[PDB]
Design a protein around this ligand. Structure first.
Ligand SMILES: Nc1ncnc2c1ncn2[C@@H]1O[C@H](COP(=O)(O)OC(=O)[C@@H](N)Cc2ccccc2)[C@@H](O)[C@H]1O
Ligand SMILES: [Mg+2]
Length: 405
């Protein structure tokens, strides 16, 4: 805790919202997506190449300008309001975000840059960068990850260029919103935009994975797009979501200054995509510096297919930790941050297995099961005991929990 936070050369006063941890701080600026030979950098480059090739290959395809070095520090307005996210939306909870204060935060998604880039007059761009979220702990979640945003605008004439009387067709109208379109969009326009969005993503996936992947489109919701979809890839017998997308909400596009255009946007999870593409078992591997892992991604050309050889999996050490939550003062993700700070990448996952209220005291008891497993070696019972004891004491000091164990 403190009164002022210094980050990337700037100073931010603290308030009731401030909840950034020093641990997260050490990762800001690391930019793995810009680190030559890093798997995330690799994905980013192969995605860029795909878009370049399509630009040079099809007259219709616009040139996408790429922004992969935008500061992750943004305003709540950039991250939330510009995207039409309601003031009472659960995605704004202090429990799920790293707020520097009430006005600034570490972006929770690359969509935080849509409005600004649109406002600058760009028709097609990609944003690649580290995003931050407070979440649970397991092999598929990390406080920091990366996304790649894409935005593509269409003018009326351009969208209907391939149709005879196309110029008599329109992008906008004044009807009602349905499951298939916004209230100011015509179905003619939406059908073409949606088709372009899905075809583009399908071609990008074919380029990255080959024409053998099994994908499916799932209808979903986002305040900033409509209709909206999630694309899922069937991997290891399970359908996994790898991206969100949809037709951009017109209110957003209009407020940025492009009131004469209609467009689509998407945001893909790079780690999610990389773990499927290279069969990487644990997200923590992206942050280790073990050459056994990293050396495998140093290719001659980004098109050199890397055959990822999984590292050995070492034994885990499991310990439980129980304590009484402070009298009406505590958050699950708060404990998760403390674990990331003390246990670092030694912890594989934390599971809240039990919770109950004591009648006499009125206090709530929480019991978490902590799985300790190092991605690079075998952990000794000894070093785990010490890390675990430090977690217990810290929990009592910072979280205000009462050691129940
Ligand atoms: N910690 C994590 N590490 C890796 N992948 C994660 C993590 N948390 C979630 N994911 C995966 O990321 C996919 C989505 O991220 P969400 O954060 O869920 O969506 C978004 O972040 C939206 N901004 C996407 C978007 C952009 C533009 C237009 C429309 C929609 C999820 O389906 C999920 O499987
Ligand atoms: Mg998504």
């Amino acid at each position: 805790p403190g009164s002022v936070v210094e980050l990337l050369g700037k100073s931010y006063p603290q308030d009731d919202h401030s909840n950034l941890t020093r641990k997260v701080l050490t990762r800001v600026g690391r930019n793995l997506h810009n680190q030559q030979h890093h798997p995330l950098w690799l994905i980013k480059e192969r995605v860029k190449e795909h878009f370049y090739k399509q630009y040079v290959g099809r007259f219709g395809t616009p040139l996408f300008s790429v922004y992969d070095n935008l500061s992750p520090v943004v305003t709540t307005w950039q991250n939330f309001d510009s995207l039409l996210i309601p003031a009472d939306h659960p995605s704004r909870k202090k429990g799920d975000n790293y707020y520097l204060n009430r006005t600034h935060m570490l972006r929770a998604h690359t969509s935080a840059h849509q409005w600004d880039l649109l406002h600058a007059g760009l028709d097609a761009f990609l944003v690649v960068g580290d995003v931050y979220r407070r979440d649970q702990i397991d092999s598929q979640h990390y406080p920091i990850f990366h996304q790649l945003e894409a935005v593509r605008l269409f003018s009326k004439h351009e969208l209907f260029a391939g149709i005879k009387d196309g110029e008599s067709l329109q992008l906008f109208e004044q009807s009602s919103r349905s499951a298939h379109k916004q209230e100011t969009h015509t179905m003619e326009a939406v059908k073409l935009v949606e088709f372009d969005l899905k075809q583009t993503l399908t071609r990008l996936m074919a380029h990255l994975f080959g024409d053998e992947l099994e994908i499916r489109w799932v209808d979903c919701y986002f305040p900033f797009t409509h209709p909206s979809f999630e694309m899922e890839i069937n991997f290891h017998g399970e359908w996994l979501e790898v991206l969100g997308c949809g037709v951009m909400e017109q209110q957003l596009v209009n407020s940025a200054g492009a009131q004469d255009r209609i467009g689509w946007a998407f945001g893909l999870g790079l780690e999610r995509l990389a773990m499927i593409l290279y069969d990487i078992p644990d997200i923590r591997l992206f942050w280790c510096e073990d050459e056994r892992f990293l050396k495998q991604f140093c290719v001659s050309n980004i098109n050199q297919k890397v055959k990822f050889q999984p590292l050995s999996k070492y034994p885990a050490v499991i310990n439980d930790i129980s304590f009484w939550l402070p009298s009406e003062n505590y958050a699950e993700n708060d404990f998760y941050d403390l674990v990331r700070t003390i246990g670092g990448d030694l912890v594989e996952k934390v599971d809240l297995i039990d919770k109950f209220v004591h009648p006499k005291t009125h206090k709530t008891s929480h019991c978490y099961r902590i799985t300790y497993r190092h991605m690079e070696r075998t952990l000794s019972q000894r070093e785990v005991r010490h890390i675990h004891q430090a977690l217990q004491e810290a929990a009592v000091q910072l979280l205000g929990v009462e050691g129940r164990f």
